[PDB]
Design a protein around this ligand. Structure first.
Ligand SMILES: Nc1ncnc2c1ncn2[C@@H]1O[C@H](CSCC[C@H](N)C(=O)O)[C@@H](O)[C@H]1O
Length: 311
């Protein structure tokens, strides 16, 4: 997270209005969760979430960040005259000393592409287990991951078939290098050819890092006779617990784009499909053993298995 030291990443998250306004509406519409409480903001970045908490009436907010962005947060917090409520702490949540032993509320923007990329939920779960007061709460509290079948033969060809004739030379062996790299892009919802299928439900209050390594059967109900060229992944985020004004956002292709877009696993061998059909398959999501921040996602479908990496 040298990357998180740069303004660009933060600028992009703050320009993600669906994302930021969701956390804002949650905090502002449910002040009772925050009023007079002690709040921990895991990975506070510019301090945006910590300031939302302060405005909703938090007694004390600890903004923790490992990146150099923390120093901007310090200045930002002072600029807004919030330094008597929000403390900034520089370091990894799993190793910094905090000046308190328990907190009432943990808030965090931890989600990666396909929800789990970067493995920042591990860090939030660490904070939850070590610092959340008995009876306390962690937000967002519920998360889900869905898959949807895609048909886009022309896009498939632009990316894959590119390699067949490059300035007069065959480079078709490159296709074997292309297929395994999951693509992060916004999908044209016109190209969706199934109903979605949930593949994971996460309760952030009771889940363990162990549960974030998972298999799931899935069935996609095809809505359009055509050819399946890819499977897409996405996630929904819920703010529910203790909320009278409950907040949800989706990062699916049917919803307003976010900076997470969608994660797309291209099929090595696309295959036909009929409206009404129940397309059956299996997905496995594991940390990349060499780099636990990277994901490995294995799709079995139409009698073939393929492992994909998210960077
Ligand atoms: N284990 C960890 N300990 C402390 N900070 C972490 C961390 N893992 C990731 N981060 C920080 O978490 C931030 C996530 S980006 C979210 C930034 C801000 N809360 C916002 O909502 O806009 C990054 O700044 C990164 O440096």
């Amino acid at each position: 997270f040298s990357s998180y030291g740069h303004y660009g990443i933060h600028e992009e998250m703050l320009k993600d209005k669906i994302r930021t306004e969701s956390y804002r509406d949650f905090i502002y519409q449910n002040p009772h969760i925050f009023k007079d409480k002690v709040v921990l903001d895991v990975g506070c970045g510019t301090g945006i979430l910590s300031m939302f908490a302060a405005k909703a009436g938090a007694k004390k907010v600890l903004g923790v960040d490992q990146s150099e962005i923390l120093y901007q947060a310090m200045d930002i917090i002072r600029l807004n005259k919030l330094e008597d409520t929000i403390t900034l702490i520089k370091g990894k949540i799993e190793e910094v000393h905090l000046p308190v032993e328990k907190v009432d509320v943990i808030i965090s923007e931890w989600m990666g592409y396909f929800l789990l990329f970067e493995s920042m939920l591990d860090s939030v779960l660490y904070a939850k287990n070590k610092y959340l007061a008995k009876g306390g709460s962690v937000y967002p509290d519920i998360c889900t991951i869905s898959l949807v079948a895609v048909s886009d033969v022309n896009k498939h060809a632009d990316r894959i078939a590119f390699w067949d004739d490059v300035y007069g030379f065959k480079m078709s062996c490159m296709k074997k290098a292309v297929i395994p790299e999951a693509v992060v892009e916004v999908l044209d919802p016109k190209t969706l050819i199934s109903e979605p299928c949930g593949i994971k439900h996460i309760d952030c209050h009771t889940t363990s890092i162990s549960d974030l390594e998972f298999s799931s059967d899935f069935t996609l109900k095809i809505t359009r006779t055509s050819m399946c060229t890819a499977i897409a992944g996405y996630f929904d985020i819920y703010f529910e617990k203790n909320c009278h004004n409950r907040v949800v956002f989706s990062t699916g292709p049917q919803s307003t784009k976010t900076h997470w877009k969608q994660t797309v696993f291209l099929l090595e061998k696309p295959f036909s499909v009929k409206a009404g059909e129940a397309l059956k398959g299996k997905v496995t999501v594991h940390k990349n053993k060499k780099d636990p921040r990277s994901l490995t996602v294995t799709l079995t479908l139409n009698n073939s298995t393929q492992t994909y990496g998210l960077q």
